[PDB]
Structures are given as C-alpha cells and as structure tokens.
C-alpha cells in the first residue's frame, strides 16, 4: 500500500481492513492513507487485516 496520491477529499466506504502502527484498524486503504497524511507521515502499516 502506497499513499502517494494522498490525501483525497473523499473515500468510498467498503470494508477491507488494514492495521496501523497506532494499533487502530483502518477500514480501507483510502481511510488509512488519509490518516497517514494527517499524521504528517508518522503513521505506518503494521499488517493487513484487523489489528
């Protein structure tokens, strides 16, 4: 998962979870990538699926 094309003003709401380094399950890649951006690049991917 690469978040280069982010941020994005909107995301679709399908559920395909990712686990972030903050131990939060992100609902999908768009959701996760927008958070990474908001974190000024400090949040990273722990693994695929729920935390």
């Amino acid at each position: 998962v690469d978040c280069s094309e982010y941020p994005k003003p909107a995301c679709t709401h399908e559920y395909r979870p990712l686990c972030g380094s903050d131990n939060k399950t992100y609902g999908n890649k768009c959701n996760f990538c927008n958070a990474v951006v908001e974190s000024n690049g400090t949040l990273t991917l722990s693994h695929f699926g729920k935390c």
């Binding site: 003003p9 909107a10 995301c11 679709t12 709401h13 399908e14 559920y15 992100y26 609902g27």
Partner: protein
C-alpha cells in the same frame, strides 16, 4: 435480510441497500464500487450462506449495482431494519434523511446539496450525487438512505466519521430503479 444488513463479497464487506423486484424476480441494490469485480455475495463472514450473484454494476460515473438472489429460503424483507419502505422519491435540499449501515448502524441528518461531483481519484469520478451531513464509515457503503417510508439513495462515500461528524454522498436510488426496471416493495 433487509436494508442496512452486512453483505460479503470475496473482497470485503458492504451493506445491502434495498430489496427490490421485477415480476417475480428478486434482487438487492448496493453500491457500484462494491459490485465492481464481485461475482458472488454471502450473508456472513464465514461465507456459508449465499445470497446471490452480481447482475449489474455501474461505477464510476454512477455508483449503483444490483445482485440477483439465488438463495431461495432467506427472507427478503422490503424494509430497512425494522422500517417499512413503500416507495421511492427524489431528494430535495433540506429533506430530513436517515441512513443505515452494517458498521455504524442508523444515523440521521439532512440533504445539503444535489448534483454533486465526487472525485475518488485515479479517474474514479461520480456525478449527480446527493450531499448530506450524515456520517458514514467503512462497511456502510451501499446502505440505504431513506426518509420515513421513502427510499432515497445508496451510500457511496465521503469524509469524516461518526464521532467527529462528516459529509456523506449518496447515489439517487430513482436512477438505479429506472436503469434496472425494478421497484421497491
């Protein structure tokens, strides 16, 4: 199974929009981005209870899809959770609406704009969307937007979340009903 309930494809989870029919053929509507590349749909994460197979998908540009029921025993309620749905209508600015999704459940708000263009990036642009101040989160895609007993739209996407508040865009259901020649019941 009814509007707002979880539905699973091979790739993830979305929500059922509305149960609809044509003649004696039953289907359900959901988001086009959910039906895109999906063939079979199940009622559970274990994938042991089949629902049916994708019969149509329109995304991007629009955001609706339709799934034909192949499961003969599962109840196909013409409701949204407990709520009866008896017709479909066009959204209007200021209209009080309610959405139900498999992740966040039921949330209410109002229609704040019509004919909105939403750019999901990578060339995925959808047009003619209903804008609202209702929140939604991953898993809620395709769920119904209704107003009393009136079917209004299908959850597409947006920003924010239910804790802080957000903006959610919906695909007008009238357009989907016309495209497939089906109707709510």
């Amino acid at each position: 199974i009814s509007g707002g309930d979880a539905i699973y494809s091979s790739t993830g989870r979305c929500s059922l929009g509305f149960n609809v029919r044509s003649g004696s053929t039953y289907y359900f509507l959901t988001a086009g981005h959910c039906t895109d590349g999906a063939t079979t749909w199940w009622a559970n994460s274990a994938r042991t209870t089949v629902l049916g197979t994708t019969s149509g998908s329109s995304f991007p540009n629009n955001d609706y899809g339709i799934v034909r029921y192949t499961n003969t025993t599962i109840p196909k309620d013409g409701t949204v959770g407990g709520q009866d749905i008896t017709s479909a209508a066009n959204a209007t600015v200021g209209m009080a609406v309610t959405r139900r999704g498999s992740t966040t459940g039921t949330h209410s708000g109002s229609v704040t704009a019509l004919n909105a263009t939403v750019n999901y990036g990578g060339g995925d642009v959808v047009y003619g969307m209903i804008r609202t101040n209702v929140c939604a989160e991953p898993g809620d895609s395709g769920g119904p937007l209704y107003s009393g007993t009136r079917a209004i739209g299908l959850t597409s996407g947006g920003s924010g979340n239910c804790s802080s508040g957000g903006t959610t865009f919906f695909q007008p259901v009238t357009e989907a009903l016309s495209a497939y020649g089906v109707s709510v019941y």
